Amino acid sequence: HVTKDMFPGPYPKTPEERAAAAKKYNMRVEDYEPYPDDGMGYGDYPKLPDRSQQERDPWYDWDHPDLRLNWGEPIHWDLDMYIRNRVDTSPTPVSWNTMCKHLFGFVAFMLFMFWVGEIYPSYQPVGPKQYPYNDLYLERGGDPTKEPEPVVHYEI
Amino acid sequence: MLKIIIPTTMLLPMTWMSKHNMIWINATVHSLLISLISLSLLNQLGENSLNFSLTFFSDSLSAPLLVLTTWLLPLMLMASQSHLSKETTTRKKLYITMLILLQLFLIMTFTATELILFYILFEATLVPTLIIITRWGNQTERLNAGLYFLFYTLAGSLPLLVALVYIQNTTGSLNFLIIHYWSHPLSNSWSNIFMWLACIMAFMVKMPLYGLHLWLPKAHVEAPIAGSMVLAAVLLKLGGYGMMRITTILNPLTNYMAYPFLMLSMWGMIMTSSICLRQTDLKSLIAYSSVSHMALVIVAIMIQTPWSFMGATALMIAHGLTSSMLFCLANTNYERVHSRTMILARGLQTLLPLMATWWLVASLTNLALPPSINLIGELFIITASFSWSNITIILMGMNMMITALYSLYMLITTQRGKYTHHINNIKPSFTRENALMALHILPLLLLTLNPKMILGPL
Amino acid sequence: MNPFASLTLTTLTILTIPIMMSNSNIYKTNLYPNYVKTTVSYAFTLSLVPLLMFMHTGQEMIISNWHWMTLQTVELSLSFKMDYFSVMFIPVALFVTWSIMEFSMWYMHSDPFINRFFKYLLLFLITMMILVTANNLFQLFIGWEGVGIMSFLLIGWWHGRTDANTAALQAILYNRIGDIGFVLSMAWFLTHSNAWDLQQIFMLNNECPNMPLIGLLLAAAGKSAQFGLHPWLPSAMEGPTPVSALLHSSTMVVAGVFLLIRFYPLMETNKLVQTMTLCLGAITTLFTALCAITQNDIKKIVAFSTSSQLGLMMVTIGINQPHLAFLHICMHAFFKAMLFMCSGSIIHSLNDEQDIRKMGGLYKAMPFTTTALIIGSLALTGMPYLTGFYSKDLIIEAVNMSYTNAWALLMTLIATSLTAAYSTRIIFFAFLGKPRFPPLVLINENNPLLINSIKRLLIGSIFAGFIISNNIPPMTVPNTTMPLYMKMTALIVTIMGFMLALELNNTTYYLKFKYPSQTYKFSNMLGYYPSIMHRLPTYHNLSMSQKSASSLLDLIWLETILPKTTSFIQMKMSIMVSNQKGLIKLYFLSFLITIMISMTLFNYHE
Amino acid sequence: SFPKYKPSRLATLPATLDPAEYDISPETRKAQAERLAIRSRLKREYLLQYNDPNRLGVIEDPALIRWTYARSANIYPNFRPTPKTSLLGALFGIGPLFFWYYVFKTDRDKKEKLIQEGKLDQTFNISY
Amino acid sequence: AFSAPAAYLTHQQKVLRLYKRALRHLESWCVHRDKYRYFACLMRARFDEHKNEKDMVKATQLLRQAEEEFWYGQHPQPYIFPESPGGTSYERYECYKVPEWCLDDWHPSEKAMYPDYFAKREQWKRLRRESWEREVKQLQEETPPGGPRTEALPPARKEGDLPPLWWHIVTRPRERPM
Amino acid sequence: SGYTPDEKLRLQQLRELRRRWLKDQELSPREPVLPPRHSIFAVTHVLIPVWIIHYYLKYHVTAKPYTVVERKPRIFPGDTILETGEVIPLMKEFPDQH
Ligand SMILES: CCCCCCCCCCCCCCCCCC(=O)OC[C@H](COP(=O)([O-])OCC(O)COP(=O)([O-])OC[C@@H](COC(=O)CCCCCCCCCCCCCCCCC)OC(=O)CCCCCCCCCCCCCCCCC)OC(=O)CCCCCCCCCCCCCCCCC
Numbered sequence A: 001h002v003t004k005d006m007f008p009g010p011y012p013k014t015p016e017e018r019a020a021a022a023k024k025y026n027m028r029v030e031d032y033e034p035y036p037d038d039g040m041g042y043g044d045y046p047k048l049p050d051r052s053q054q055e056r057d058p059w060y061d062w063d064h065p066d067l068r069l070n071w072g073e074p075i076h077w078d079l080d081m082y083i084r085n086r087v088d089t090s091p092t093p094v095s096w097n098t099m100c101k102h103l104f105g106f107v108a109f110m111l112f113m114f115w116v117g118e119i120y121p122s123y124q125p126v127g128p129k130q131y132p133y134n135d136l137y138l139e140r141g142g143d144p145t146k147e148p149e150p151v152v153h154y155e156i
Numbered sequence B: 001m002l003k004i005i006i007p008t009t010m011l012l013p014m015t016w017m018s019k020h021n022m023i024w025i026n027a028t029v030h031s032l033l034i035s036l037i038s039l040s041l042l043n044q045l046g047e048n049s050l051n052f053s054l055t056f057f058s059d060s061l062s063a064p065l066l067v068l069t070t071w072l073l074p075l076m077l078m079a080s081q082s083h084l085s086k087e088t089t090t091r092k093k094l095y096i097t098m099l100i101l102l103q104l105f106l107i108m109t110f111t112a113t114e115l116i117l118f119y120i121l122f123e124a125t126l127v128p129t130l131i132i133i134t135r136w137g138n139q140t141e142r143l144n145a146g147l148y149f150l151f152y153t154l155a156g157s158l159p160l161l162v163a164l165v166y167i168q169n170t171t172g173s174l175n176f177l178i179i180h181y182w183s184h185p186l187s188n189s190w191s192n193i194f195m196w197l198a199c200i201m202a203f204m205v206k207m208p209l210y211g212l213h214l215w216l217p218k219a220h221v222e223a224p225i226a227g228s229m230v231l232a233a234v235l236l237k238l239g240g241y242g243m244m245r246i247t248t249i250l251n252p253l254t255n256y257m258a259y260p261f262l263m264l265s266m267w268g269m270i271m272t273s274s275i276c277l278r279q280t281d282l283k284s285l286i287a288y289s290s291v292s293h294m295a296l297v298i299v300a301i302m303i304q305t306p307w308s309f310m311g312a313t314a315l316m317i318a319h320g321l322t323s324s325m326l327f328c329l330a331n332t333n334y335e336r337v338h339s340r341t342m343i344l345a346r347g348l349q350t351l352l353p354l355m356a357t358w359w360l361v362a363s364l365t366n367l368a369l370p371p372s373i374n375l376i377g378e379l380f381i382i383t384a385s386f387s388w389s390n391i392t393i394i395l396m397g398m399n400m401m402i403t404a405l406y407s408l409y410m411l412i413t414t415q416r417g418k419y420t421h422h423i424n425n426i427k428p429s430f431t432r433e434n435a436l437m438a439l440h441i442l443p444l445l446l447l448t449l450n451p452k453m454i455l456g457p458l
Numbered sequence C: 001m002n003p004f005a006s007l008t009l010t011t012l013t014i015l016t017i018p019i020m021m022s023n024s025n026i027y028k029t030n031l032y033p034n035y036v037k038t039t040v041s042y043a044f045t046l047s048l049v050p051l052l053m054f055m056h057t058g059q060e061m062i063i064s065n066w067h068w069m070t071l072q073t074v075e076l077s078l079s080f081k082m083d084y085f086s087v088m089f090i091p092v093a094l095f096v097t098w099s100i101m102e103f104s105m106w107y108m109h110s111d112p113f114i115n116r117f118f119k120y121l122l123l124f125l126i127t128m129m130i131l132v133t134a135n136n137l138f139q140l141f142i143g144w145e146g147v148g149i150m151s152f153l154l155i156g157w158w159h160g161r162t163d164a165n166t167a168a169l170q171a172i173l174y175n176r177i178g179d180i181g182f183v184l185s186m187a188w189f190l191t192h193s194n195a196w197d198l199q200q201i202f203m204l205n206n207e208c209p210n211m212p213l214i215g216l217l218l219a220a221a222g223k224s225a226q227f228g229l230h231p232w233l234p235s236a237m238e239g240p241t242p243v244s245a246l247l248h249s250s251t252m253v254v255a256g257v258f259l260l261i262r263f264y265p266l267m268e269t270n271k272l273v274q275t276m277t278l279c280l281g282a283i284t285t286l287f288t289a290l291c292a293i294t295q296n297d298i299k300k301i302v303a304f305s306t307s308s309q310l311g312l313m314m315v316t317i318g319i320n321q322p323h324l325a326f327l328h329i330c331m332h333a334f335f336k337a338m339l340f341m342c343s344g345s346i347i348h349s350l351n352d353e354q355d356i357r358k359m360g361g362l363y364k365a366m367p368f369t370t371t372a373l374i375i376g377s378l379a380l381t382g383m384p385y386l387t388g389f390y391s392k393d394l395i396i397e398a399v400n401m402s403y404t405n406a407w408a409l410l411m412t413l414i415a416t417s418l419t420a421a422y423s424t425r426i427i428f429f430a431f432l433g434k435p436r437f438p439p440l441v442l443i444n445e446n447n448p449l450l451i452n453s454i455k456r457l458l459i460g461s462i463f464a465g466f467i468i469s470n471n472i473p474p475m476t477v478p479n480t481t482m483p484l485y486m487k488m489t490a491l492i493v494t495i496m497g498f499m500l501a502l503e504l505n506n507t508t509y510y511l512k513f514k515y516p517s518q519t520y521k522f523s524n525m526l527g528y529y530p531s532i533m534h535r536l537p538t539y540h541n542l543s544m545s546q547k548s549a550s551s552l553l554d555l556i557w558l559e560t561i562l563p564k565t566t567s568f569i570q571m572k573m574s575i576m577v578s579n580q581k582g583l584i585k586l587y588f589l590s591f592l593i594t595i596m597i598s599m600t601l602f603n604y605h606e
Numbered sequence D: 001s002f003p004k005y006k007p008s009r010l011a012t013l014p015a016t017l018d019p020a021e022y023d024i025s026p027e028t029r030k031a032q033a034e035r036l037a038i039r040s041r042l043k044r045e046y047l048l049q050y051n052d053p054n055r056l057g058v059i060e061d062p063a064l065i066r067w068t069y070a071r072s073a074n075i076y077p078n079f080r081p082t083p084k085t086s087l088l089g090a091l092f093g094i095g096p097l098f099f100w101y102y103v104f105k106t107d108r109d110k111k112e113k114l115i116q117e118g119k120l121d122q123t124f125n126i127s128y
Numbered sequence E: 001a002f003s004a005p006a007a008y009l010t011h012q013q014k015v016l017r018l019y020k021r022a023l024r025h026l027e028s029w030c031v032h033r034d035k036y037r038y039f040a041c042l043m044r045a046r047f048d049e050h051k052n053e054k055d056m057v058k059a060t061q062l063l064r065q066a067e068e069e070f071w072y073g074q075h076p077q078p079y080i081f082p083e084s085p086g087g088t089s090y091e092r093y094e095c096y097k098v099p100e101w102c103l104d105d106w107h108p109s110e111k112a113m114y115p116d117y118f119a120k121r122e123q124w125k126r127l128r129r130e131s132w133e134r135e136v137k138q139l140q141e142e143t144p145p146g147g148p149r150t151e152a153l154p155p156a157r158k159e160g161d162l163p164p165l166w167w168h169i170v171t172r173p174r175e176r177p178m
Numbered sequence F: 001s002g003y004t005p006d007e008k009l010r011l012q013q014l015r016e017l018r019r020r021w022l023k024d025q026e027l028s029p030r031e032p033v034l035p036p037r038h039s040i041f042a043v044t045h046v047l048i049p050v051w052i053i054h055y056y057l058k059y060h061v062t063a064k065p066y067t068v069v070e071r072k073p074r075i076f077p078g079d080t081i082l083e084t085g086e087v088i089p090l091m092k093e094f095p096d097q098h
């Protein structure tokens, strides 16, 4: 039972068109604001604030408690992105651009330290391990018809 | 193979002579019997095909497709009788007649020995589908969908026809056996390039290829449930079957004519999988899923290896079953709530547990959980692509990550969470719907038990 | 006929019987959980016999029983490998599952769907056995994805809760990132060695190249929650406590490590992949042990401890000691499952409270749980002659005495100090001091199921190290000579961690309040890794998949080029052609023009 | 006094840190009253049908229908070819295709050249 | 959750909410009870130090500074009650909640068990059917001409009336349904 | 501060109705009107499956080559072979670093 007028229309130009659009979307005129009139195809649909559903008050009696939505209120263009099973934009205790610096610094420092420790390795003061039968020539792949150069170990 | 064709033609007057309240029972019983008869075509040889006559033959590629068609007809009948209860007797008989004619055309298409007969039947399948969509669809968009379904197909197939007759003037035959035995290489000229394009584009638009796929979401969303079932399960596989038949005369041109189509298939597989992540209509999500899986099939056919051909056959069969099941699952909810918006009805596991189990199994087969034949086909195609180029594992890998995501997303949106408070008309699942889901899903696992029946002639 | 093969097959086969009975008149009664638990106990007792045969004569087998399908030259068959790893892991997993099922009989007593829970637990166990005993890569992949799906279902057990569904999907996402590498390894092995089974792969790869091993390492990093793909394991604590004790602490999450243990002949011949594995394990163990020391949820602390121990296992694999890593898996299962069960006992006693800040003095109020948790913590820290000693101590000594990256060694030592630190945190905040829970006291651990399960795992945590170490053949060369200070390194660093943690915890009794430092904020908020990595890539991916893939391309430009342009052109030409006034003057003039043109253009040229 | 918190797109500004709610005007109070009135009217309209004993089915929501229609059917009628639209379409619909074509063509040319020279180590490469 | 919200919060309401939040986060920092009591008394003294400020502008400036200090010094991992919106058992039992109208679809064999319960259910349904029209009429009378301005609902005022829009509040599933 | 009299009264009425509804959820003593050996576990769950598996392995699986392959037993100096009866000599006169 939804009339054609109720359905979303083109970008509004005249203030009367903006008032009609705000009435259609159940909004105050001073609160209603469309997307910029480029060719992207937004048309009449309002541009709501970019907060996710996690930021909504959980102690309110929402008509849909899991979605935290009320019946009849305008729905954000990107609601399915913000369903709170998904992207969260909630305020953090530590500023963004400070979490990023700390995380990147830690990761880069660990990478550099691993490279340094690779080119300054650690080992015990011992010589190479000695194996009896010409470094086990026959055991590591055979080739018994080549007579390899003998490998000899002496006592010390 | 008239022992399968004639019983369907007999289904026609049996439906038109039936008593007004026995049409569904008779049609379902005899459709199931015809499927049982068609089960005998799976006895195939290792060297050549079953050459029944001068007109019809059966290969190891077409026999599972025929079995799938004959098995899909009774499922379509079961799925259709709910929303057609208010219809008049004559219109119900006309709907069943459309379904029967579609089955007959598909059966003759998959077994034609000549390419022009194949073309004629493969175009004849258009009329019943268009009539079903534009007459028994629910919304006003169906008309537009029908137009998009028609011309997109014909703009691809009219050049092919020309090429076909041209070939018959050059080699003297369009018989597939003669064409295979007397094959000659295609030189590198502009004429040969345009012949290749004429021979390929119709099947490309049938798959559909990414960029030529816009007809599919419209047609598969606006159609009634049986229309969507037959469009996703069988009619998309016409392109793959035709491509695997026609590629025998296109070498060695394919070696470099496949590059734009390979790039389109891989990138558009990523793109359609991504599109599935932000979809408000549940049917459109399943349609874009079909597009991604068919892009995989296109890659497999284009790289032209035995492993890729086996993977393509397995993937086509598995996708047919899985996508038909998913469309039926979405249709149950639509019939309950009369809306296709995915977030309208939520928490359905609390209200319908067995249907939730069916949803879980269907979404598990969609993401190709091993050892399902979905996974077997996908893995064979991925291995062949890796042999073709080691970098493909990137794109394919990304696809495997995205698919599961959107698949589980669908499940989590419909079955989990809390139920919508104001929706109070969700009745318990009928025996018919549960039987439909079981008759979809059990053959999938049974085929997993014996996978060489869907692996094709290679 | 040498009962080894029959017994090994029967152990796995009898686990599926309750699955087949799940549609009988035992799944609808209250006797189903006991039936499943008894089946698992019988399976463990039966599996004890092939282990004895192996310990006597070192008997090993492969059984290729069913031929599934054959490609042109590649044959795929249902084959089981019954080597030392399988016959050692099966009894340990069965023992832990038996204890955890008996525990769940008491923990989940009020759940209306407890039968489905046990059915689910058994399905996970079956998939894990399929993973462990597989002889070809396809069967292993079957087990891999089976345990992944079972973990997804068990994490979202309370499916009306949004966070559980989010955590389940997160686990699936990270595991799929690992599955990419698994599939890469499978494709490389089939196209280069013409096989997916282990024997031919070992024969045909004497010097394995980088790509298959890097794919295997990516799969292992996904499955064992290493630093790049770590966050899903702590979030998997959304499930019930038995799921955390079984799947996400001791049995399933070692699977990735197990994978690298399976392919150790190939890893033995590649230095670069070994170095990558060592560095990945070192950073993982350090980062997770550093996150664990400030957490307030007990399940989170135990999960980060599990992740740190998995990092230590990866380090052990990286220094070319796979058998030590397998021994550590077996040792860690016991006390990790016991620690999770003790945490669950505390949670159930305090009305489902999980914050340690609201747990006061349980040392006297919960004596048996206190004893079990103390023994488990001592075993986890490698206290001498307990279960954890016989693996962790040798791992630390082997890391000390090898030609290895020095930074990885330093991070391993710091992590093994932080292990004792967070163990001290758990004990100090949960058991010492004065009560901090609500005044209505319902503390009660007097239930035979809980006591018996924890007691079995406790006997294991005390004696299994000695028993297993003295009954296996030596597959490694012992470090007989070492400087005394490097022989005591693990004990010394554990003692320093203990003392420092005790001091910093004792300072909390003072009447002084200070705002936290940035280092504490980094530790508590998990390096900010979930804060950034779960917001920026997800936002960009979803926003691009709407704005560009769906709207800009599919709904606008693809429409614009082919169908809309055709419609526009045809409509304009129709308007041009059909709009004539119907005046004979105009088109008879047109006829004259046509006649003249046809006489000049076509007729003059003959 | 204390280090300042600065908001970002994915970590927004808290309400208690918002200057706009600390300097208020009677116009703002009137706007808040109007907002609450609109919300209350919608809530009453919904609750009247929700508690109706003779109501069976789905309470249709015009906002949901508007959202789905705007996301699906209202997009093309509101599209104009502009420099931004044309540039973004060309980039995101053509650039990836040629990027991947160049990558794959280079890789396959290298592999083919290696195969012609007979140095690729194709031993045991039976299945393809 | 039960009370209808107002159009805005007053200054006193904001001060009290900040006081509760600050005390909760301080308890999160001060784990032990005696230390928490000491610092909570200090916080209460700091709060009531500026209780008698007659200049409202200075009061809101003080509130602003206090909220900035709270955001700087908040516990990143504060204690949450297990069933609170951030707790570990927040929506644990929502999957066990089944709406009452589902009972209308039970097979008569299922309803053959529990006869007395379904007789009581029929009585409740009769009461709701008899009360609906009076509820609607009362709402029509009591509503101002320009629509309602708050979400508050009136009580019953007549002889045997029921408070309008009571069915879905009274027939809540439960807090622990199964 | 506090409730207004209207809010208080509505709360009392709703509370009375809700308490009645919760009381009505109680079950009368007859509400669930239902309409109308020791060691057998070790036999049906261990013995029968092991019989089936042993039969299948002994007479079907091992009827084809290379289906059950065991790694060969270890041989040490001083051992005697069961089949041939051959003995293996000792180990080269240990230097005896006692
Ligand atoms: C004998 C030969 C061997 C020699 C070994 C070395 C010799 C020295 C011996 C001792 C060495 C360490 C002693 C303890 C450390 C201090 C502990 C502490 O908590 O101090 C309090 C203080 C914060 O306390 P708070 O905030 O008031 O506590 C909050 C409340 O108490 C809230 O209270 P709560 O209840 O929540 O509990 C808080 C919790 C935790 O509280 C915290 O969150 C603080 C975290 C501190 C512990 C972390 C240690 C692990 C270090 C790994 C670092 C790897 C590299 C990372 C690089 C980052 C790159 C950006 O407290 C604990 O549970 C205990 C913490 C750990 C105690 C056990 C210590 C064992 C591990 C370290 C010693 C190893 C011993 C054997 C060594 C074997 C080697 C051969 O921590 C610090 O400030 C110092 C931490 C050190 C961080 C240095 C990183 C650099 C920072 C500036 C960066 C410069 C940027 C330059 C420009 C770059 C441009 C790109």
Ligand SMILES: CCCCCCCCCCCCCCCCC[C@@H](O)O[C@H](CO[C@H](O)CCCCCCCCCCCCCCC)COP(=O)(O)OCC[N+](C)(C)C
Pocket: B188, B189, B190, B193, B209, B210, B211, B212, B257, B260, B261
């Ligand atoms: C939306 C998706 C629709 C479906 C996608 C279909 C994909 C079709 C793309 C066709 C693939 C290739 C076609 C022909 C092969 C080579 C094309 C050419 O670019 O290559 C060079 C050709 O050289 C130059 O490029 C000449 C061609 C330039 C004129 C062609 C116009 C292309 C401009 C783009 C128009 C868009 C077409 C698609 C409309 C929708 C190779 O040099 P050369 O060796 O000498 O030619 C080989 C043939 N010989 C041997 C007989 C001589």
Ligand SMILES: CCCCCCCC/C=C/CCCCCCCC(=O)OC[C@H](COP(=O)(O)OCCN)OC(=O)CCCCCCC/C=C/CCCCCCCC
Pocket: A085, A086, A087, B397, B398, B401, B405, C163, C166, C167, C169, C170, C173, C177, C180, C217, C218, C221, C226, C227, C228, C229, C235, C280, C530, C533, C534, C535, C537, C538, C539, C541, C542
């Ligand atoms: C290999 C090619 C691809 C590699 C991966 C690249 C990044 C992939 C980006 C994935 C985008 C998917 C978008 C849609 C996902 C669904 C939405 C979603 O997941 O919701 C976010 C959800 C909610 O966050 P919570 O913290 O749990 O809060 C809930 C409690 N309130 O969290 C998530 O699940 C986010 C998971 C995304 C992970 C992306 C980052 C991983 C990057 C891995 C790189 C490291 C590689 C490791 C190498 C190992 C060494 C060999």
